[PDB]
Each structure stands twice: as C-alpha cells, then as structure tokens.
C-alpha cells in the first residue's frame, strides 16, 4: 500500500544510494542495471514499511539492532529500537526520480503527483547550490511546501565550506519559502544522525492538504509488465500502470479513460481526439493484497492491456480521468504564464547568469508541460501573460490546472517558468 509518496530528489553528484539506505535501509533498482559510478539516474521503484516500536527510533526489518552497509570494511550502524514485536504503522511508498539537473522535466512530472519530498542537498559542491532552490520553487507553486531537507555529507565537507554554502543558499532563497519545516544536516557517509530524523518524519510529514473527495484523476508515470510466459496460460490478466492519484479516489472495478485520446482517422484537420477506455482489474501494491487504492499514493492499476505496451519505460506522464467526465478538447488554447526572475538550470561563479528569462515571441515552438503530458505547440498571438497557442495533438483541459514551461537554454531543456491554463 501507499499512503504518502515521498520523493528522493536531489541533483548531480552526492550519492543517492548512500543517503537513501541510511534513512530507510532500502536500495532502489530498475532493470538493465547497471549501478553507476555516480547517482541513480535510473527511474528506480521502491516501497517500504514504516514501523514503530515506541522508541525515538524507527525499526528496520531487523528491529533489535540494524547493521547498514556502504563499505564492508567498516560496519555502519543504525538504531531500530529495542524489540517486543514491531508494529506496522502504515506502508509508505517512495518515488526515486532519475537524478541530475538535466532530468528536470521528468522530475517535474513525478513531483506533480507525489505528496511530499526529501530534498537531498549536497555540501561538497557549489555554494549557491542552483538545483535545490529550483526544485523548492516549483514545489511551492504547485501547492505543496512540507519538505524536509537532508544535508547528505558533513564528514567529508569541512565546516568552513558548509558554512559559506549555508550563507549563499539562505540569500538566494529570499523569494522562495518552502523549507519552513526543519533542515536536518545528517551523515550518509557514516550513516549517522538517523535517530532525530525518525522522530521527525512521522510527525512533520503527513500528506499536505489535498482534495480527494472530488473526481478521480490518475496520472501514470511508470510502466510495469507482467507476468510469466506461457505459451498458453497467456493470455494475461494484464498489464500494470504505476500511477499516482492527485485528485479524487480510484476504487476497484471502475472504468477509466486515458484522456489525451487517439485522433480520428487521417490527420488533415486538427479536431478531434477520442479517449480510450479500460476497466480496472486490480489495485495492487507491495506483495500485500488490497482492493483499494488510497489517494495520495502510488498504486499498480492492473488494466486489461497487453505486456507489449509496458515492456520498458513507455509511459512517463499520461492523464487519465474517470468516467463519463468531459475535459474540453481545445486545439487552440489560451495560456496564462509567468517567468522566473533568474535563468536557473545551470549556474557558474562567473555570474553567467541570473538575468530574467527572455519573453515568448510568435512563430516559435514552445514546450507546454500540461498535467504530466508534454505536448508541443506554436504561439500564434503573444502578449506578456496571454498567448494563444495552437497544439499539434489536441489538449484535454481537465481544470484550470498548472503548467511548466521549459526552454532549451543552449543544448538541453531547463526549467524557466510556470503558469496556468485558462
């Protein structure tokens, strides 16, 4: 099951595996592994079990003592309390995003459907620390702000370096406040300072207020198949979409529609798209039986699709609405938008740059990330906060919603701005 979706977002170089294993005791994995010489840039999957033993510490599976691993020469230690049958509090789910600054668009998609996050900040690199702030700002805009920061290393990092960094971060974030919950410097190199984190993470972090009594909308981000050849057992009860719910609640047996649609025979016009319909077979999480899918949670919705469509990563952000609901099928759409007051995505100490993002101009192709979908469209009319865009494939406008706007700064996209559909 999943009750809260905690993300493990960070940026290029500081170790994802070391810090995640220190807090949870869980290592993430994605097939075709490959286990890197840097951070996990795979789209890892993981769930975890969150227990209490009525101690200031949070149990692992080994609930009397727990010996971590990051080197075999030393024996890392974590505290899981003293035992007398360890009580399951809930089953929590994680979202390991692909790391690095460049993976911003995917990080955005995943962020937009996960309740909370754990911002793995570094300390052994750049003092203004660009990406940490970038992340925080996007998060505060979408509607969430209960984030709990973890400072990965302080052992390798000297206390002068870490101090200069703390000054520069606190001076950059003069416009962004989304870290008003505590900032816990920890060790991940030594895997220590865990015990105060254990008291904190059950206290400070519920699901930040969301509306789940509205209309079911599911956003699938990860692709799962299913099951075991065959041949003939085969043909299947079928193919599983890893999606999170950000609005409403999906109950079992519901019919659900994937809403960007498929376009009617031949493309010569530009209207219309027709949603595709699939009934929900099962609402599967962990290795534990369920028939429900708690909202604000990452759930495996088995639908009667075939393995072939989920064979690898093939779904990264599709919007699914249930059922008989009507999102409007615009072909030309009126976007309101705003831009960041810095150009943030890449930063250097040569001061190049933090100049305000250049405006939009007509007859330019721009990426509109609407929902977790990423469609392309050209701007036909251009006023500062009212552009009219004509889209290549029609766009389902669910609600007034949000958008994320990115620019190819010089060789890859970087987050520049946001806004809302109208």
């Amino acid at each position: 099951q999943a009750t809260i979706n905690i993300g493990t977002i960070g940026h290029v170089a500081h170790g994802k595996s070391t810090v995640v294993k220190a807090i949870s005791g869980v290592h993430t994995v994605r097939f075709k592994n490959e286990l890197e010489r840097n951070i996990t840039i795979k789209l890892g999957y993981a769930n975890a079990k969150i227990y209490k033993l009525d101690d200031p510490s949070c149990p692992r599976p080994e609930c009397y003592r727990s010996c971590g691993s990051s080197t075999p020469d030393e024996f890392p230690t974590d505290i899981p309390g003293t035992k007398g049958n360890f009580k399951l509090v809930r089953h929590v789910s994680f979202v390991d995003c692909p790391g690095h600054d460049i993976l911003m668009a995917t990080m955005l998609n995943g962020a937009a459907v996960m309740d909370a996050a754990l911002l793995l900040i570094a300390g052994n690199e750049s003092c203004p620390q660009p990406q940490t702030s970038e992340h925080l700002a996007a998060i505060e805009i979408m509607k969430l702000k209960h984030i709990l920061i973890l400072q990965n290393k302080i052992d390798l990092v000297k206390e002068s370096q870490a101090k200069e960094q703390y000054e520069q971060i606190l001076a950059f974030v003069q416009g962004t406040v989304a870290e008003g919950a505590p900032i816990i410097p920890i060790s991940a190199q030594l895997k220590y300072n865990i015990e105060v984190v254990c008291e904190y993470i059950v206290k400070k972090i519920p699901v930040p207020p969301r509306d789940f009594t509205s209309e079911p909308r599911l956003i699938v981000i990860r692709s799962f198949d299913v099951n075991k050849p065959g041949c003939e057992v085969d043909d299947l009860k079928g193919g599983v979409a890893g999606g999170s719910i950000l609005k409403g609640v999906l109950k079992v047996g519901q019919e659900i529609e994937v809403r960007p649609g498929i376009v009617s025979k031949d493309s010569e016009g530009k209207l219309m798209c027709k949603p595709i319909f699939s009934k929900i077979v099962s609402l599967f999480a962990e290795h534990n039986d369920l028939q429900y899918a708690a909202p604000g949670g990452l759930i495996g919705v088995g639908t009667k699709i075939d393995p072939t469509l989920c064979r690898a990563d093939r779904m990264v952000g599709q919007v699914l609405g249930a059922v008989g609901a009507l999102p409007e099928i615009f072909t030309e759409l009126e976007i309101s938008y705003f831009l960041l007051r810095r150009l943030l995505g890449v930063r250097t100490e040569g001061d190049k740059k933090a100049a305000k993002v250049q405006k939009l101009s007509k007859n330019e192709v721009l990426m509109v990330n609407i929902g977790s979908l990423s469609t392309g469209g050209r701007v036909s009319a251009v006023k500062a906060d009212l552009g009219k865009i004509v889209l290549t494939n029609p766009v389902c406008t669910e609600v007034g919603e949000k958008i994320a706007l990115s620019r190819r700064v010089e060789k890859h996209w970087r987050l520049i701005g946001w806004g809302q559909i109208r």
């Binding site: 041949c231 299947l236 009934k279 009667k304 075939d306 072939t308």
Partner: protein
C-alpha cells in the same frame, strides 16, 4: 567388394580414389567407388601450372575425387586425371559416397549377423536389391537409399523383395536416428495490437482454430519469444504440405484481433 553396379568403371566417369602410394610416373592409388582395383594418377595431369613439388596439397591417406581419362579394357590400367576437373563433380561424387556409406552401414550389420568365408556375401545382397532401385535413378546421384527411406515409412519394398530378420532393426535405427528429427524452420509472423480490452480472449480463440477442420484444438506449436509474437510451426511431423496451413493461419489471427480495435494489413 564393389560399390557400384559394375566392377568396371566407365571412361570419363567421376570416381573417388584413396592415395596410398607415390610412383615415379605419378601416384598409384586404389579406387573406392567401384571395385577396388589399381589406377595410376599421372604427374603431368596434376595441374596446368608450376609444380615446384607438393606433398602438402596432394598427399597419402586422403580420399580425393578425380576423373577417369582412360581405361585399358583387358589390362585393368585405370588412367586418372585432375587436368580437367571441377569442384562440382566432387560434390556429385561426395553425394554418392555419403549415400553408399549409409546403405552399406545398414548392410554391414547383416553381414555380421551371418558367418561367412565367401567374399560374395555382400554381392548377393547387392545384385537382388540394389540394381532394380538404382538403374532407374542414379544419375542425380541416387542409389538404394531412396527405396529404403520410402520402405520404412510406407512398406512396399519389403513386400517386393526379401526381408531379413535383422536388416529391419538396423534399417529402422539408421533412418530414424539420423533422419528423424528432420526438419523445417518455418515461422508464423504474428503481431498483436489491441486498444479495447477483449483482445486477450480474442487471440486465444483465434490460435486454437487458426485453420478449420479441427475438433476444437489444432495440433500446432505455439511459441512465445516475445509478447505479441506467436510463432506457429504448423502441420508438425516433417511438414510437406503445411505451407498453406502456415500462410492462411496468419490471415485468421490478423482479422480476429482487428475487431477489438486493432488495425492490420488487408
């Protein structure tokens, strides 16, 4: 013993020899494709070039195909040549060699089930059975093998000619071991696309009756190499007429899946 209808090779025939001696006139060699008699290869017919001396391309203890240039009819001198010869003739002779080997391997067990001190034992078997098989067909390279292969799978040669009480066992063994399995590499090209939800059950029905004239289940071999691909080796035994079963079965499967929101070739 002979290994051909005659004990006398013809003139201009493709033959096989085994190098066993080197003469001052060439190389004295025995034949191993007819009766085993002496034949002289000549050192002026080895090649049409520069021979600064080879015992490392032509050497003792190797079966080599060659062409009989001349035969002295009553003196038994089988003159031989490699001056005009081609690889193609070697292939044709290799075929005869392999067929003779399998027939003789069955008909050697027969000779070891009998006790003999007369060379003529194998000859007796040869004259009565072999000739009527081979005279009609032996120009492509055929011998008794076609008759034998037909005989095990449909008796009609063991009802027209003598049956020994130990030939049959060995005959069955060498045919059924070496030419069963026995073989095709046919594949049915099948792909599946569904955007409905009843495609899963649709495919199962289509597979089990991809050809009419079944009880309710075909004796095909479904294979899953990947999820959309259903490879069907059809009419499996040896396959000699399951080409139409294979071809038309693909059309059935493509139609059944197209109803469930698939789009496929017409």
């Amino acid at each position: 013993c002979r290994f051909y209808q005659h004990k006398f090779p013809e003139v201009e025939d493709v033959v096989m020899v085994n190098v066993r001696s080197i003469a001052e006139m060439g190389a004295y060699v025995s034949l191993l494709e007819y009766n085993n008699i002496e034949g002289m290869i000549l050192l002026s017919e080895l090649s049409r070039r520069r021979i600064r001396s080879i015992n490392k391309l032509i050497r003792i203890g190797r079966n080599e195909c060659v062409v009989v240039i001349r035969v002295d009819k009553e003196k038994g001198y089988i003159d031989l040549s490699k001056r005009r010869v081609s690889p193609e003739e070697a292939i044709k002779c290799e075929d005869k060699f392999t067929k003779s080997k399998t027939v003789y391997s069955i008909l050697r067990h027969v000779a070891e089930v009998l006790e003999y001190t007369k060379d003529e034992q194998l000859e007796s078997l040869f004259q009565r059975t072999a000739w009527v098989f081979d005279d009609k067909y032996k120009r492509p390279g055929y011998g008794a093998y076609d008759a034998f292969k037909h005989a095990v799978s449909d008796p009609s040669i063991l009802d027209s000619l003598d049956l020994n009480e130990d030939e049959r066992e060995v005959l069955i063994n060498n045919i059924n071991r070496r030419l069963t399995p026995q073989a095709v590499k046919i594949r049915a090209d099948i792909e599946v696309a569904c955007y409905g939800y009843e495609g899963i059950d649709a495919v199962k029905e289509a597979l089990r009756a991809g050809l009419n004239c079944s009880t309710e289940t075909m004796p095909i071999k479904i294979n899953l190499i990947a999820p959309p691909r259903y490879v069907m080796t059809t009419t499996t035994l040896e396959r000699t007429e399951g080409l139409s079963v294979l071809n038309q079965a693909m059309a059935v499967i493509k139609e059944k899946i197209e109803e469930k929101r698939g789009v496929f070739n017409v």
